[PDB]
Design a binder for this molecule. Structure first.
Ligand SMILES: Nc1ncnc2c1ncn2[C@@H]1O[C@H](CO)[C@@H](NC(=O)[C@@H](N)CO)[C@H]1O
Ligand SMILES: Nc1ncnc2c1ncn2[C@@H]1O[C@H](CO)[C@@H](NC(=O)[C@@H](N)CO)[C@H]1O
Lengths: 143, 147
């Protein structure tokens, strides 16, 4: 798994259309979204992650939570982003792991939002530009 | 080298402070920068790239130029983005490679812009969301990974 963390003033998205046959079902309201003073987590689930979804998810939750603590953010936004890596996990497993992370962060007590899985989306983001505003993590399960 | 390409409506940056003891020398007017309808190339120079800076720069110029052609981006913005990777190349070497990449894209005929090297910068971007609006490219010396 590859994670790109951007501490932002805001994150806003707009769904264009589906990028695969079976995307996450969405209601009209889910086609757009926005969050402010938020740690945006762009995540690409890699095929290596298929080896142990729970393991990679738990570690991702931990790493993202720690960064959120470091940048002093209470809002986090999970953004499916297939283009951080070239070795992607199958859609079904990718969506599952992304939902695990999303739920795990909520379990830590954060205010979490997320964009729908399986769509092409336009987005706007404003990075704060502080020393820890842009960080990344490479997480691979081994168990 | 890891590259994240974002075809955007615009890119805007604001230098917040220096991240290195001796960042790239720039002037006041360069503390803020902007470019419209551009292919933004966020680049992290990796440790492995130290083995052959020229080889990596050349392949980076080619990969970036190919995407620009694909999405019809006339403007390209070289944006140093260290944390795109976890295994970074020496700062001085990174600077050198980014300069070579900039020079190469300019020679290709594109309108090239760039963000100053060695600073912490806030930035605003608007990804167009098209099928090729977000792409990833990994470029490394052949000697460090038969590719
Ligand atoms: N391994 C993976 N990791 C994360 N996301 C993945 C994935 N495989 C598929 N997706 C989702 O399907 C859309 C098209 O690939 C992906 N869409 C996107 O990455 C949009 N930002 C494009 O504009 C994403 O929602
Ligand atoms: N290996 C590397 N690849 C690309 N850029 C690198 C680098 N090593 C150092 N830099 C530059 O120094 C700033 C602090 O690391 C970096 N600054 C940044 O990446 C800003 N986006 C932070 O806001 C960058 O200008």
């Amino acid at each position: 798994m590859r994670v790109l963390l951007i501490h932002s003033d805001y994150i806003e998205y707009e769904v264009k259309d589906k990028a695969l046959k079976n995307p996450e079902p969405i209601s009209e309201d889910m086609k757009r979204g926005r969050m402010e003073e938020v740690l945006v987590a762009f995540i690409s689930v890699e095929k290596v992650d298929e080896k142990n979804p729970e393991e990679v998810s738990l570690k991702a939750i931990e790493e993202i939570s720690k960064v959120a603590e470091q940048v002093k953010a209470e809002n986090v936004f999970v953004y499916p982003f297939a283009h951080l890596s070239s070795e992607l996990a199958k859609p079904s497993v990718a969506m599952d792991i992304l939902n695990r992370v999303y739920q795990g962060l909520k379990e830590r007590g954060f205010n979490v939002g997320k964009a729908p899985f399986g769509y092409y989306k336009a987005f706007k983001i404003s990075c704060k530009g502080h020393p820890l505003a842009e960080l990344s993590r490479t997480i691979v399960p081994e168990e």
